[PDB]
Predict the structure.
Amino acid sequence: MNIFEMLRIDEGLRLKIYKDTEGYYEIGIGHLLTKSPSLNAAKSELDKAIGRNTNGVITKDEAEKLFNQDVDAAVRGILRNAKLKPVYDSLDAVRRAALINMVFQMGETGVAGFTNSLRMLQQKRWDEAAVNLAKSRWYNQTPNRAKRVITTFRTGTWDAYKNL
Ligand SMILES: [Cl-]
Ligand SMILES: [Cl-]
């Protein structure tokens, strides 16, 4: 199991522009197109992202290029971030994947404000951090996903992903 497998699991795959649970415009494997309401807009973006006149639809290949690009970006993001880096560095491999999952999902900005859990993570207070993580808009908005991630942080294993 790895980060790609993980995220593919959590984000699915769609060749069509679609709204996200947050109503926003996405495509592929969780590729955020735009925080605004114009399909025309998202569409523009799509085209720009792909470098061709897509018309709202892309190839698997395409989805994956974005995906590739997106994991890369998350990682760098983390690595450059002053609040993130220390956590990351302190963690084990599985747990790192979980971090990257969150940043992907919600952005480095978003994650960097999980200030408390971050500390707890850093101090390897796995159960407390999990509790903490759970008191979040994030959790309430996408419970099941949140749970998998949270577990991962909790256990340092891939169990929550095994079987699906
Ligand atoms: Cl892009
Ligand atoms: Cl969910």
Summary: The pocket of chloride ion (ligand 2) is lined by residues 142-145 (CB under 6 Å).
